Design an enzyme around this catalytic site. Structure first.
Site, PDB file in Angstrom:
ATOM      1  N   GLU A  62      44.008  41.292  34.085  1.00 57.56           N
ATOM      2  CA  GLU A  62      43.822  42.706  34.367  1.00 57.56           C
ATOM      3  C   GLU A  62      45.101  43.356  34.841  1.00 57.56           C
ATOM      4  O   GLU A  62      45.813  42.773  35.666  1.00 57.56           O
ATOM      5  CB  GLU A  62      42.780  42.902  35.448  1.00 57.56           C
ATOM      6  CG  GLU A  62      42.323  44.335  35.551  1.00 57.56           C
ATOM      7  CD  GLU A  62      41.556  44.583  36.804  1.00 57.56           C
ATOM      8  OE1 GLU A  62      41.767  43.810  37.764  1.00 57.56           O
ATOM      9  OE2 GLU A  62      40.743  45.540  36.837  1.00 57.56           O
TER      10      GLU A  62
ATOM     11  N   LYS B 183      36.865  50.100  31.839  1.00 59.37           N
ATOM     12  CA  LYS B 183      36.104  49.370  32.847  1.00 59.37           C
ATOM     13  C   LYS B 183      34.759  50.042  33.213  1.00 59.37           C
ATOM     14  O   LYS B 183      34.731  51.201  33.648  1.00 59.37           O
ATOM     15  CB  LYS B 183      36.987  49.193  34.090  1.00 59.37           C
ATOM     16  CG  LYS B 183      36.677  47.968  34.912  1.00 59.37           C
ATOM     17  CD  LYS B 183      37.597  47.871  36.089  1.00 59.37           C
ATOM     18  CE  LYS B 183      37.012  46.975  37.157  1.00 59.37           C
ATOM     19  NZ  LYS B 183      38.078  46.338  37.993  1.00 59.37           N
TER      20      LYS B 183
ATOM     21  N   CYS C 277      37.174  42.768  34.735  1.00 58.11           N
ATOM     22  CA  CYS C 277      37.241  42.448  36.173  1.00 58.11           C
ATOM     23  C   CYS C 277      35.899  42.399  36.920  1.00 58.11           C
ATOM     24  O   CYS C 277      35.148  41.453  36.763  1.00 58.11           O
ATOM     25  CB  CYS C 277      38.280  43.347  36.873  1.00 58.11           C
ATOM     26  SG  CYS C 277      38.798  42.841  38.546  1.00 58.11           S
TER      27      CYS C 277
END
Lengths: 379, 379, 382
Positions: free
Chosen positions: B113, B190, B227
């Site tokens: 990430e 995300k 993540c």
């Protein structure tokens, strides 16, 4: 107060001209308050100030005269103490302020943001600060506030940390509307969540899913724009589109950068949407048990503040009340004729000319992935 | 590495039994790597390890054999230096790692990430850290990475801070997929944004609006779970429902509380959705110019870490690769037959028995305001 | 050949390294051992079953007392040969579990739970309907619940058990059902298996259909309890829905063998606890079971009579990512674990998983995905 500062330095003839441009009136429309309300204020060491807004007489409609009480306050005992005790000390103080508002003849009373607690969101600590969160409808604060609403025959609006038992015990920033009958009316959750400097609210809760509700009470159509939603004209706008006449703005802001905006945003909202605006801000400085940083280059510290109060009321015709104090507890009583709203709408024609269909289409395109801004380049 | 620790303390007969229960195999299915790839790794001081997954032979379908390279790395020069220099030093290091992956015969390469920068989100400072944000498609990192994709004939997946020029210069956490032709394929933002401890990501960007895209490349259907999305089974699930065969999980986690989960979540995702999982974590500790606090009671500090690496690959049959190092830079090459996915689906029957219609209805009710949980009380 | 993983690691690792391995494998550097009454240890030793106590804890709260609760998970084998009158088979298992429940009571448990279909051999591998379906009994009025309710009343404890149900009102249909009995002795309700397996020897789809009871959560004086039955283990959305309904402890009675299944055991129930910030109690059957007639398992293999071995290894996973050591893989056992139910909210507030679930997004995505003309969100090369 800024108004007391200008009236102390300007000749009565120029003061009349400056007041007209800064507020919306040559001189303050002072409302006389019952002597007993002034008593409770004096004894308990908070300011009380009354102001008056008016409307034209109508042929088809009686005057709809309404009194609102905005309460700005500070926290009471140190933030290093049992959280139940911290809340209770704030309860007892606000109780006598609400009593004052009742005896001043208020019909609606509203608090600042998260009034029940220190504004602990600067610490980013979950413990014990999350224990301040309570049930919107059955939490102790609503239950005790509802007995006051029933007894004083007044609508109470209060802003608290909500804990949602049904939805995974999630925490929310929520306004609760209690009817003058004592019955719970409903709730609104904060639409726009800040993540700026000390205001790490995104840490504690997500963005609201309650829309833009407007509460139809016997004292007018009321709405609550919570804190950071202040910076969003479209938020103000949607409350208006839903037919709000008074939009409350409970807040908690500090700082050098934030203060210039205070006089602007709530004010503009009232003008653009032709309704009343009631921005209420916390007061005083609050210190916490442990060190925290603010996201600037600076050293760790424990003092969060000062919260600059200065609560006021803006009217749909572009006029506004003088602010409350910047550091002292206060109650702001303002009498208004709700009929001013339609009158301003029919005169200025803002709602007539909004072109909502155009803007809904433009906003739609702008939100889509392959959006290309309307840009004219040199050929 | 945990595997090297167990193989150093257990008799070959018990090691076989512990490995079977902890991984999915009695012994490691080691892949032999070209000697030149091992050379580039040795000279530049990063680990390189090859592993192999296999499938049953099919009558109607050829083996779809594919090699993926997971790159875990640390930052290079001090965080108090020109941000362009910081990125360039990380560029040059990852360039030789990508070269190694090419010579190891990889077809897909993926980064951790926000690989291009120090993980500055713990500071909550906007300056100069926001200047790391770049255009998803035209940013310098994608352009230089695309020349590598074209030259090595390999799909590159990389995770960066995106700045969206068309949408008000907003900042996003985004994965970018570059095709083996060199052409930009698309992006994923995300879905789930953390606000925990030092991971003040909610401060920098909002939740993703790109859905759950799956990228159809000539090396398989690829997806990217970014993540913190790791903690959301429903996120993993939707990638699966969209037909993903490999879901990459670029991440950056530290800590005592987080590490036990690392072996669990990515692993479970692979099992439940019968596809491959590639969790990649940052490595090393990073220190910053100014003090910051973490939202626990503790003193202000400058050291953020250590990031515990340990990247691995989990297979749909419940087997998994040994982790990479916890503190050393590494490249993980794994060969797999994409056909294992359908084979596991047809055998275990998880997709057969998901009852998606039931769950879509249940989730709908649960999200509504007047939702009352299905609770059975004593009568 | 392996009997207990935790025992195996602590016999071959230096105390320094063991602390590191245990931290990453479990959620704790060393086991939080609960001391058990000596009498409870006696009933266990005489009757030849393991008893092990562990403790989970929470931080102290200002507005809420500690909500401390003791759960007993019972893993056991069948007892007499599967070629014996089915009433005798059940009775033999009854009497053994009776003394295990007795031990749980004296260990101070408040809730006790069984493995799946605890009352019978796991005869679903044979695919025979006779006499195996005669094991099916009424959920509320069946002999097992009646006997178990006397125990619940006498020991003041909630009992959760998993049985084959026969539904007399709905056409004598057979179901896989969990029954919750209150500590008052009164029947609370039931939950039927949501996800039915049809894999290898697990021909459960042959015997019963998918459950129609939703995802009920039982509000008892010892917490909000739920039951995820067996194969539902493999469905994150199943676990999630119990969480959305406010469950604090989700029990997972199971019966799994074999080489491909065991690696998952430590993963799925553990993940559910983490994702949903509640307690998870996976219990598995133990021992191997042989049947009167030959059967095949759907691989290319020869017919056989031995079904097993069931690998036990019951444990408890906590919402903060920590977990208990597993019970034995071949020996009967009782797992007593003390926990403070307050950890659930504390973990929810800290990690923020429920805060960030985006359930409305997922409800809409799952809806589209289930519709006929569904087109997956696929980005191709232009």
């Amino acid at each position: 107060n800024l108004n007391d500062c200008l009236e102390k330095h300007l000749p009565p003839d120029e003061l009349k001209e400056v007041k007209r441009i800064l507020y919306g009136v040559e001189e303050d429309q002072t409302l006389e308050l019952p002597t007993s309300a002034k008593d409770i204020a004096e004894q308990n060491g908070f300011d009380i100030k009354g102001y008056r807004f008016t409307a034209r007489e109508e042929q088809t409609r009686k005057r709809r005269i309404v009194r609102v009480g905005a309460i700005q306050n500070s926290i009471v005992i140190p933030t290093t103490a049992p959280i139940e005790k911290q809340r209770e000390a704030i309860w007892n103080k606000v109780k006598t302020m609400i009593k004052a508002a009742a005896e001043a003849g208020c019909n609606i009373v509203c608090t600042q943001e998260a009034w029940t607690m220190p504004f602990a969101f600067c610490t980013r600590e979950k413990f014990p600060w999350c224990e301040f969160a309570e049930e919107a409808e059955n939490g102790p604060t609503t239950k005790m506030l509802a007995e006051l609403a029933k007894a004083y025959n007044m609508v109470i609006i209060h802003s608290i940390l909500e804990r949602d038992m049904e939805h995974g015990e999630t925490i929310w920033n929520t306004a609760v509307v209690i009817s003058n009958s004592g019955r719970y009316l409903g709730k609104h959750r904060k639409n726009h969540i800040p993540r700026v400097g000390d205001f790490n609210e995104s840490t504690y809760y997500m963005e609201g899913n309650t829309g833009h509700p407007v509460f139809e009470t016997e004292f007018g159509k009321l709405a609550v724009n919570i804190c950071y939603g202040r910076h969003h004209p479209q938020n103000w706008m949607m409350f208006g589109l839903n037919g709000a006449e008074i939009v409350f703005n409970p807040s908690a802001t500090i700082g050098r950068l934030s203060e210039p905006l205070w006089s602007i945003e709530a004010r503009n909202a009232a003008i653009a949407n032709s309704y009343f605006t009631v921005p209420i801000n916390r007061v005083g400085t609050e210190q916490f048990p442990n060190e925290y940083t603010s996201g600037d280059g600076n050293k760790a510290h424990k003092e969060f503040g000062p919260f600059y109060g200065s609560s006021y009321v803006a009217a749909p015709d572009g006029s506004r009340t003088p602010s409350l104090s910047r550091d002292k507890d206060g109650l702001l009583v303002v009498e208004l004729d709700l009929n001013l709203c339609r009158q301003v709408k029919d005169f200025w024609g803002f709602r007539m000319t909004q072109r909502v269909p155009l803007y809904a289409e433009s906003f739609k395109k702008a939100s889509e992935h392959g959006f290309k801004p309307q840009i004219i380049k040199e050929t």
